[PDB]
Amino acid sequence: SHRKYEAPRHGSLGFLPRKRAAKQRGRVKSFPKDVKSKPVALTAFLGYKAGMTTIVRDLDRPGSKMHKREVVEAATVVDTPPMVVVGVVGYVETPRGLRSLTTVWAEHLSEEVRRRFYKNWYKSKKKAFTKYSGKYATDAKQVETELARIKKYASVVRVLAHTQIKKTPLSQKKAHLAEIQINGGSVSDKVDWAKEHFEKEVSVDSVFEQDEMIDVIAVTKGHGFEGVTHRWGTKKLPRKTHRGLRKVACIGAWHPANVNWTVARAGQNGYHHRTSINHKVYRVGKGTDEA
Amino acid sequence: SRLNEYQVIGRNLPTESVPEPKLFRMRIFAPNTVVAKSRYWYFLQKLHKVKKASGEIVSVNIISEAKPTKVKTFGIWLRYESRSGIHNMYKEYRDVTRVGAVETMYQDLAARHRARFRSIHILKVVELEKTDDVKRQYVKQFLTKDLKFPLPHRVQKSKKLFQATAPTTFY
Amino acid sequence: SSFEKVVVIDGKGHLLGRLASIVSKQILNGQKVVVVRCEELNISGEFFRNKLKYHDYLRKATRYNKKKGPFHFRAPSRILYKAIRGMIPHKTARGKAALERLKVFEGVPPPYDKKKRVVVPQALRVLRLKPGRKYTTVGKLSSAVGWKYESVVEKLEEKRKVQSAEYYAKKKALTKKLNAAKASTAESEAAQKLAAFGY
Amino acid sequence: MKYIQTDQILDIPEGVTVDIKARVVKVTGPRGELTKDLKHIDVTFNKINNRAIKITVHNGDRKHVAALRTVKSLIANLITGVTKGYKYKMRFVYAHFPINVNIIKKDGQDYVEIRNFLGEKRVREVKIHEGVTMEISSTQKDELIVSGNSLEAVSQNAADIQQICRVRNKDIRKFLDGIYVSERGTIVEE
Amino acid sequence: SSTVKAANWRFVEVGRVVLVDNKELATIVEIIDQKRVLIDGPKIQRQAIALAKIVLTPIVLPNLPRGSRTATVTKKWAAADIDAKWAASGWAKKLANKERRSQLSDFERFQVMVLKKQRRFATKKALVKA
Amino acid sequence: AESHRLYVKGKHISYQRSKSVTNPNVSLIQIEGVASPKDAKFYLGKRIAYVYRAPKEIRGSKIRVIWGKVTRTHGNNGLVRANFKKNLPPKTFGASVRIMLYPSNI
RNA sequence: CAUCGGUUUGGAGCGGCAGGAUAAUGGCGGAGGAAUGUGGCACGGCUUCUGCUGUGUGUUAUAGCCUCUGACGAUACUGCCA
RNA sequence: CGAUGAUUUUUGCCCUGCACAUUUUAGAUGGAUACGAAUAAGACUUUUUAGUCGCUGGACCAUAGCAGGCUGGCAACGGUGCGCUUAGCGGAAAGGCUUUGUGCGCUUGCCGGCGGAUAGCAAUGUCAACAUGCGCGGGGAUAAAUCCUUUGCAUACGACUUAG
């Protein structure tokens, strides 16, 4: 028999499985499409969500009841110390997708980024990137050979940059290291820009402008194991139900003789990878600004 | 089938009343002489008060083609049974032998009308001597003067499964 | 006919099912087969009809768990592989070993770009289809059903064709001088004797 | 019936040089050159002389034979498009709101812009195919001239202009407004 | 000019020479149907055959009347000397070479190998300087 | 001198079988270069050797042979039926055999 | 491996004989006739008439065909060979 | 599936030149012998008229030597293998394709001399590539992870983010 009355689903099937994110750092699934005409610039940045605050703003929207009127809005603060460029990766387009052909590193890597490659830094000899550091023996011909390979073969050039986490109030000492795609210019232009930026800092003022619309990639707040009532927002059962009421009453018909993937079940809630689009940049503030 | 044209001659069994019964002849297109005599009785009983028991087969002879190596146009008058009723058609065929035009006809009625050998009666097979005697356009187009035509897109059958060179269809 | 170590089939201009059946019988009999240029295969019938057939294929999936269902691969090589696997007892160890003998690719990747590619006349579209019949290219169907790498494959294919054209120009230049040299050594005692033997 | 042979006789005027290779027709005449690909039809061409070409189908059934006179007509259209031209004359039809048609050029591509069709605020843009010339008449009011060599492109542009002005949700027997092809002829009078 | 590329087909007509069984020569004396012809020749029985069983050759027996009988076919075949024209083509030469190769023995194959070695020596010597 | 082969290459194709039941006593052999029953009738009565390797040494050799002979042709495509002293194991479906040139009648 | 005996599957198997319309055809000779009319002839459009070609005429000419037939001579097909 | 960092002061590890021996083979037993495209079309020449080629790979290359030995001469200054060695190209899974000079061989292009027997009238009559192990030689480098305590951006427990 059909449902007596119609009702939409509880939850979206496009966000399955509702599992924990593989990493705490949200990875950029898709980078903006490359436009050769545009100047060479970065497409992403890493910051730290500090907290939320309130602003007051003069609304500019003709035809609205709040035109030329003040509106109180919630704002979010992302602490963004400049990122340090340490590497460059070339990607060759293949009939099976993009394939990383070559990775070139800067001569010197800071301690906070070399800690990224260690699980027990205090017990180690800190041998990471020492032979590679010697690969710069006053001529570094291997480095320019690999960069020539990247120029000749790569179709997508990305930069390896890490946050300066010591400038944040966080107690973590490991830096966060990520690939940020370089858009604009030819592959040679991208490689030259990446090489000239080795061991250098890049500020948000060069990447994001004021009034820009940007997307946020992050892993959401975790809640642990969660019942169907709060995980999916299903209707609570009546008060007089035996064995509890925070359940889904019917988890399927007799046939198919299986539980469908579309039925709400208890499980892990939150700590999911989310991409949220169209967030407006109200301010790009400077650390050197005391106001 | 692989047919032959037979002369079958039969008559009613002689009786004290009728001591010299009339002799009846037919031309039968049958694969062999066993079907030839069987088909002969099948048509006398459609036309005369006689049976295989009350009759007698007098002669069964093959009628060979007079000119097996001359191209002729045969007009065939038929009577076949369809899924709904009984119809008469007249069709024309080009071949060298009289049997071969009948063999083509049986293949043609099977292909175009789903008519089986049991459902077909051949009323008459006639040689069209004059070009004016030909009525069907699908055989007159081969009676035009200085007829020439190529055979485009020749397909060659291979002995090996794999061929190391690119195929071609010239001819 | 001859037991070859590896047979490399240029898949251009071949019909999917007939090539699939021939290749299935080949690999079941212990022959190693590599099919290249699977995006150039052909299927009889118009493009829309085959697209509808593939959409009928896509509609079939396991109801209770879409992850357990049939896996609808969009790549042309995988379409050829599905056709071939349908003609192999793939749930036995013998069929598993037979399918281990098969490779299918889009384009002509290394090292097969410098090897000899053969055709199968029993499955060639130009030799099998009636000249007026409509047909579909597996690459276009794959693009229509979700395959993403058609442009990459065509770019790499034109690069490989440039390389092979240079190779063939060199080979034709070399062969031309050899034919001239053998003509100089013709009408000699060895040449005259060889002709009387059929060589 | 698999007709044994079917023939058509293409006639070439004096100033036109047809040139066919592997079923690719390349017609060159005083007004320029046009090309048509006919690889989807199995026909053979034989040059009777400089002014007559035979188009032949061997052993063709009803549809394959039907595909022959269409080939002849298409090549004849190519011939007459490079020697006499093609011109479609459209008239603007409106009851209350005049249709304002302009020939604009945006982003380096020509467009036909239609405004105030039935008083709608929507602006209609029709892309102009390469080789096709659109013109606002001086001799006639509310008339647009679509000229070119390729009859296919000229007629397709005229059809696009006619189709983009379709009346919706109204009795079209009463609301006869639109842009319709009034005349189909050649650029060169005959 | 027009410069129209025309087909180089072989036509089925009276006098067209054909190969039957890949061994004998014959000529088409009359066209029966689209798929069938009547063939005759000095060394082959006058018969009605399918065009799929025969292969058209680039040789045509000129001025042969339609429906010509065996005597006239033989007379005109001898007059035009079809056999010498056939033997002078590379097709017949390849067929004869294949037959001759098939009629070789092991000793003859060894001799062919030795002679091929000698001719290869001479050819490489000529090639290094040319 | 590069080639020392005195046998014809063959392949073990299958057992004699209907759709559902197999007869291991008869093996079907594909001979290289044979595509017609006329060609395959040359090899009738010739000896067949299946040569394989085994873990244990037998008189210093790790190579063992199963002997057989061609008995009749199979089908229309030049396959032959072979009778071996010990039936060829099913694991050899697709393996190569040796069609020896004796008992000669040339 | 050879030979034997029994069963059996074959060969591009070979030869001999018989029958049929004592095959029908075909080749040869004779008689007659016609057209999808060869040559020729008469009008033509493109060719220094460059398998030129079309339309008419009529009956083997610078091709031939069809029907009837007279004496031969084969083969096909089906049987048999102790 | 890819790229990248570091890879045990242990008698352990990596690379490489040999040599010996082992387990395995979905199954070497001369060579996987490379344009592309069309097919009612291709490729040559004269000319764009026409002629010729294909009508299958029964092809081409390689193939003679105790499973290929030991020796000699002649003719050419070639061919081929191995070894260093020069340069270029190849990123789709490039891991291969050409190339420079040079040394050692062999050369069946031709002519010779010596040797093979007995495995007995057949018995696969044992000759291949991959890998591992072990003895040397030549170089080369000198780590991490987990438990534990801590953390709460996490969390039923594992796991996770941290710090030591």
PDB file of N, CA and C in Angstrom, chain C residues 109-155:
ATOM      1  N   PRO C 109      48.982   3.279 -26.357  1.00  0.00           N
ATOM      2  CA  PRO C 109      50.021   3.660 -25.403  1.00  0.00           C
ATOM      3  C   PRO C 109      51.285   2.850 -25.617  1.00  0.00           C
ATOM      4  N   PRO C 110      52.379   3.202 -24.945  1.00  0.00           N
ATOM      5  CA  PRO C 110      53.579   2.383 -25.036  1.00  0.00           C
ATOM      6  C   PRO C 110      53.360   1.043 -24.347  1.00  0.00           C
ATOM      7  N   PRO C 111      54.077  -0.001 -24.778  1.00  0.00           N
ATOM      8  CA  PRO C 111      55.041  -0.004 -25.879  1.00  0.00           C
ATOM      9  C   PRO C 111      54.419  -0.358 -27.226  1.00  0.00           C
ATOM     10  N   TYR C 112      53.096  -0.509 -27.253  1.00  0.00           N
ATOM     11  CA  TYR C 112      52.400  -1.012 -28.428  1.00  0.00           C
ATOM     12  C   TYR C 112      52.365  -0.032 -29.590  1.00  0.00           C
ATOM     13  N   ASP C 113      52.781   1.219 -29.398  1.00  0.00           N
ATOM     14  CA  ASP C 113      52.794   2.146 -30.521  1.00  0.00           C
ATOM     15  C   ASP C 113      53.897   1.837 -31.520  1.00  0.00           C
ATOM     16  N   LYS C 114      54.893   1.041 -31.135  1.00  0.00           N
ATOM     17  CA  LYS C 114      55.985   0.668 -32.024  1.00  0.00           C
ATOM     18  C   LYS C 114      55.931  -0.808 -32.396  1.00  0.00           C
ATOM     19  N   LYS C 115      54.753  -1.411 -32.342  1.00  0.00           N
ATOM     20  CA  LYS C 115      54.545  -2.805 -32.696  1.00  0.00           C
ATOM     21  C   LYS C 115      53.610  -2.888 -33.897  1.00  0.00           C
ATOM     22  N   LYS C 116      53.449  -4.099 -34.414  1.00  0.00           N
ATOM     23  CA  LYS C 116      52.623  -4.341 -35.589  1.00  0.00           C
ATOM     24  C   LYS C 116      51.180  -4.573 -35.158  1.00  0.00           C
ATOM     25  N   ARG C 117      50.263  -3.777 -35.696  1.00  0.00           N
ATOM     26  CA  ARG C 117      48.841  -3.920 -35.412  1.00  0.00           C
ATOM     27  C   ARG C 117      48.150  -4.608 -36.579  1.00  0.00           C
ATOM     28  N   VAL C 118      47.335  -5.609 -36.267  1.00  0.00           N
ATOM     29  CA  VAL C 118      46.622  -6.380 -37.271  1.00  0.00           C
ATOM     30  C   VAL C 118      45.128  -6.113 -37.128  1.00  0.00           C
ATOM     31  N   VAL C 119      44.361  -6.586 -38.107  1.00  0.00           N
ATOM     32  CA  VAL C 119      42.911  -6.466 -38.090  1.00  0.00           C
ATOM     33  C   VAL C 119      42.301  -7.857 -38.183  1.00  0.00           C
ATOM     34  N   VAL C 120      41.005  -7.921 -37.914  1.00  0.00           N
ATOM     35  CA  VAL C 120      40.228  -9.148 -38.003  1.00  0.00           C
ATOM     36  C   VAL C 120      39.150  -8.947 -39.059  1.00  0.00           C
ATOM     37  N   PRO C 121      39.335  -9.498 -40.260  1.00  0.00           N
ATOM     38  CA  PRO C 121      38.364  -9.250 -41.338  1.00  0.00           C
ATOM     39  C   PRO C 121      36.957  -9.722 -41.022  1.00  0.00           C
ATOM     40  N   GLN C 122      36.803 -10.746 -40.184  1.00  0.00           N
ATOM     41  CA  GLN C 122      35.475 -11.227 -39.832  1.00  0.00           C
ATOM     42  C   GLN C 122      34.702 -10.249 -38.959  1.00  0.00           C
ATOM     43  N   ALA C 123      35.354  -9.215 -38.431  1.00  0.00           N
ATOM     44  CA  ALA C 123      34.705  -8.257 -37.548  1.00  0.00           C
ATOM     45  C   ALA C 123      34.814  -6.824 -38.048  1.00  0.00           C
ATOM     46  N   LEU C 124      35.404  -6.605 -39.218  1.00  0.00           N
ATOM     47  CA  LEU C 124      35.592  -5.256 -39.730  1.00  0.00           C
ATOM     48  C   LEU C 124      34.264  -4.688 -40.210  1.00  0.00           C
ATOM     49  N   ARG C 125      33.962  -3.463 -39.782  1.00  0.00           N
ATOM     50  CA  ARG C 125      32.675  -2.854 -40.101  1.00  0.00           C
ATOM     51  C   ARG C 125      32.513  -2.651 -41.601  1.00  0.00           C
ATOM     52  N   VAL C 126      33.568  -2.195 -42.276  1.00  0.00           N
ATOM     53  CA  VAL C 126      33.477  -1.922 -43.704  1.00  0.00           C
ATOM     54  C   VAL C 126      33.239  -3.194 -44.506  1.00  0.00           C
ATOM     55  N   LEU C 127      33.612  -4.353 -43.971  1.00  0.00           N
ATOM     56  CA  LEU C 127      33.419  -5.620 -44.658  1.00  0.00           C
ATOM     57  C   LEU C 127      32.151  -6.346 -44.238  1.00  0.00           C
ATOM     58  N   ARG C 128      31.559  -5.987 -43.101  1.00  0.00           N
ATOM     59  CA  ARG C 128      30.413  -6.707 -42.565  1.00  0.00           C
ATOM     60  C   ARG C 128      29.091  -5.994 -42.819  1.00  0.00           C
ATOM     61  N   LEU C 129      29.017  -4.698 -42.533  1.00  0.00           N
ATOM     62  CA  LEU C 129      27.755  -3.983 -42.640  1.00  0.00           C
ATOM     63  C   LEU C 129      27.381  -3.729 -44.090  1.00  0.00           C
ATOM     64  N   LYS C 130      26.088  -3.800 -44.363  1.00  0.00           N
ATOM     65  CA  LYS C 130      25.568  -3.401 -45.656  1.00  0.00           C
ATOM     66  C   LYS C 130      25.850  -1.915 -45.855  1.00  0.00           C
ATOM     67  N   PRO C 131      26.241  -1.485 -47.059  1.00  0.00           N
ATOM     68  CA  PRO C 131      26.819  -0.138 -47.212  1.00  0.00           C
ATOM     69  C   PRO C 131      25.919   1.011 -46.775  1.00  0.00           C
ATOM     70  N   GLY C 132      24.605   0.832 -46.728  1.00  0.00           N
ATOM     71  CA  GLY C 132      23.735   1.929 -46.348  1.00  0.00           C
ATOM     72  C   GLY C 132      23.409   2.001 -44.871  1.00  0.00           C
ATOM     73  N   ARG C 133      23.754   0.958 -44.122  1.00  0.00           N
ATOM     74  CA  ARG C 133      23.384   0.876 -42.719  1.00  0.00           C
ATOM     75  C   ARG C 133      24.125   1.923 -41.890  1.00  0.00           C
ATOM     76  N   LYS C 134      23.437   2.432 -40.875  1.00  0.00           N
ATOM     77  CA  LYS C 134      23.994   3.404 -39.947  1.00  0.00           C
ATOM     78  C   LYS C 134      24.725   2.693 -38.816  1.00  0.00           C
ATOM     79  N   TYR C 135      25.757   3.348 -38.291  1.00  0.00           N
ATOM     80  CA  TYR C 135      26.568   2.770 -37.233  1.00  0.00           C
ATOM     81  C   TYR C 135      26.973   3.856 -36.246  1.00  0.00           C
ATOM     82  N   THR C 136      27.487   3.415 -35.102  1.00  0.00           N
ATOM     83  CA  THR C 136      27.885   4.269 -33.998  1.00  0.00           C
ATOM     84  C   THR C 136      29.346   4.020 -33.664  1.00  0.00           C
ATOM     85  N   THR C 137      30.056   5.088 -33.320  1.00  0.00           N
ATOM     86  CA  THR C 137      31.421   4.988 -32.826  1.00  0.00           C
ATOM     87  C   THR C 137      31.389   4.922 -31.307  1.00  0.00           C
ATOM     88  N   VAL C 138      32.147   3.982 -30.742  1.00  0.00           N
ATOM     89  CA  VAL C 138      32.102   3.749 -29.302  1.00  0.00           C
ATOM     90  C   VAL C 138      32.627   4.953 -28.532  1.00  0.00           C
ATOM     91  N   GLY C 139      33.531   5.729 -29.128  1.00  0.00           N
ATOM     92  CA  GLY C 139      34.030   6.912 -28.446  1.00  0.00           C
ATOM     93  C   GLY C 139      32.952   7.951 -28.205  1.00  0.00           C
ATOM     94  N   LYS C 140      32.128   8.216 -29.222  1.00  0.00           N
ATOM     95  CA  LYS C 140      31.044   9.179 -29.062  1.00  0.00           C
ATOM     96  C   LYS C 140      30.021   8.695 -28.046  1.00  0.00           C
ATOM     97  N   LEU C 141      29.697   7.403 -28.073  1.00  0.00           N
ATOM     98  CA  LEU C 141      28.767   6.854 -27.093  1.00  0.00           C
ATOM     99  C   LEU C 141      29.326   6.969 -25.680  1.00  0.00           C
ATOM    100  N   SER C 142      30.617   6.680 -25.513  1.00  0.00           N
ATOM    101  CA  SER C 142      31.251   6.811 -24.207  1.00  0.00           C
ATOM    102  C   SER C 142      31.211   8.249 -23.715  1.00  0.00           C
ATOM    103  N   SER C 143      31.485   9.208 -24.601  1.00  0.00           N
ATOM    104  CA  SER C 143      31.388  10.610 -24.212  1.00  0.00           C
ATOM    105  C   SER C 143      29.962  10.974 -23.824  1.00  0.00           C
ATOM    106  N   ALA C 144      28.980  10.456 -24.559  1.00  0.00           N
ATOM    107  CA  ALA C 144      27.583  10.725 -24.253  1.00  0.00           C
ATOM    108  C   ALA C 144      27.131  10.103 -22.941  1.00  0.00           C
ATOM    109  N   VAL C 145      27.773   9.028 -22.484  1.00  0.00           N
ATOM    110  CA  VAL C 145      27.353   8.364 -21.258  1.00  0.00           C
ATOM    111  C   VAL C 145      28.266   8.686 -20.081  1.00  0.00           C
ATOM    112  N   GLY C 146      29.274   9.534 -20.273  1.00  0.00           N
ATOM    113  CA  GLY C 146      30.016  10.028 -19.129  1.00  0.00           C
ATOM    114  C   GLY C 146      31.526   9.902 -19.148  1.00  0.00           C
ATOM    115  N   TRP C 147      32.098   9.355 -20.216  1.00  0.00           N
ATOM    116  CA  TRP C 147      33.550   9.267 -20.320  1.00  0.00           C
ATOM    117  C   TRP C 147      34.140  10.663 -20.484  1.00  0.00           C
ATOM    118  N   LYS C 148      35.238  10.931 -19.778  1.00  0.00           N
ATOM    119  CA  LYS C 148      35.756  12.286 -19.638  1.00  0.00           C
ATOM    120  C   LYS C 148      36.975  12.584 -20.500  1.00  0.00           C
ATOM    121  N   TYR C 149      37.671  11.567 -21.002  1.00  0.00           N
ATOM    122  CA  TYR C 149      39.002  11.750 -21.565  1.00  0.00           C
ATOM    123  C   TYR C 149      39.038  11.567 -23.077  1.00  0.00           C
ATOM    124  N   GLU C 150      38.030  12.063 -23.791  1.00  0.00           N
ATOM    125  CA  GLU C 150      38.054  11.955 -25.246  1.00  0.00           C
ATOM    126  C   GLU C 150      39.059  12.931 -25.853  1.00  0.00           C
ATOM    127  N   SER C 151      39.085  14.169 -25.352  1.00  0.00           N
ATOM    128  CA  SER C 151      39.989  15.169 -25.910  1.00  0.00           C
ATOM    129  C   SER C 151      41.448  14.840 -25.620  1.00  0.00           C
ATOM    130  N   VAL C 152      41.746  14.346 -24.419  1.00  0.00           N
ATOM    131  CA  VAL C 152      43.111  13.932 -24.118  1.00  0.00           C
ATOM    132  C   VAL C 152      43.536  12.805 -25.045  1.00  0.00           C
ATOM    133  N   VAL C 153      42.642  11.841 -25.269  1.00  0.00           N
ATOM    134  CA  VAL C 153      42.966  10.712 -26.130  1.00  0.00           C
ATOM    135  C   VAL C 153      43.212  11.178 -27.557  1.00  0.00           C
ATOM    136  N   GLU C 154      42.399  12.113 -28.060  1.00  0.00           N
ATOM    137  CA  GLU C 154      42.613  12.575 -29.430  1.00  0.00           C
ATOM    138  C   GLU C 154      43.893  13.400 -29.560  1.00  0.00           C
ATOM    139  N   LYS C 155      44.235  14.193 -28.541  1.00  0.00           N
ATOM    140  CA  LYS C 155      45.492  14.935 -28.575  1.00  0.00           C
ATOM    141  C   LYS C 155      46.693  13.995 -28.580  1.00  0.00           C
TER     142      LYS C 155
END
